[PDB]
Amino acid sequence: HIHLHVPEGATPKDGPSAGCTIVTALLSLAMGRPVRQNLAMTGEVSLTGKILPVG
Amino acid sequence: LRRPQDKDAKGDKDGSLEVTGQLGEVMKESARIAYTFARAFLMQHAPANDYLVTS
């Protein structure tokens, strides 16, 4: 079990658009490698790693 | 405390919090956050104790 938190401030439609980071969080938490420093990222994903556009 | 703690040495269920004091919701999620973090700090700090998870 893993508690998770994403800070509020995004408009609701943007909620999913952050989602691509979540898996990265999961992966870094899982495998344990810290993610590479100074590397932002964003975008939505459609249930199998395909990426989608965002405004 | 809400129930006697050592009901079973072998038990495994969340030691559920009960928030009270006419909380606004934002405070409730923050409480959940602090709750989990405290429980983490314990296992990180004094692993032998289990008083939080077990009650």
Q: What is the enclosing helix (H) or strand (E) of B33?
A: helix B25-45
Asked if A10 and A37 touch (Cβ cutoff 8 Å), the reply is no
Residue matched to tokens 């703690």: B5
Residues of chain B with C-beta less than 8 angstroms from the C-beta of A3: 32-33, 36
The CA distances from residue B18 to A22, B1, B23, B55, in Å, are 29, 10, 11, 11
> What one-character-per-residue DSSP string does A1-55 give?
-------S-S-GGGTGGGTHHHHHHHHHHHH-PPPPSS-----EE-SSS-EE---
Method: cryo-EM
B5 touches chain A (CB under 8 A): no
Sign for the pseudo-dihedral over CA of A31, A47, A3, A41: positive
In whole angstroms, give the CA distance from residue A19 to residue A45.
7
Active site residue A17: yes
Cβ contacts of A5 on chain B, cutoff 8 Å: 33
Resolution, rounded to a tenth of an Å?
5.6
Give the nearest chain A residue to B34 (CA atoms): A3
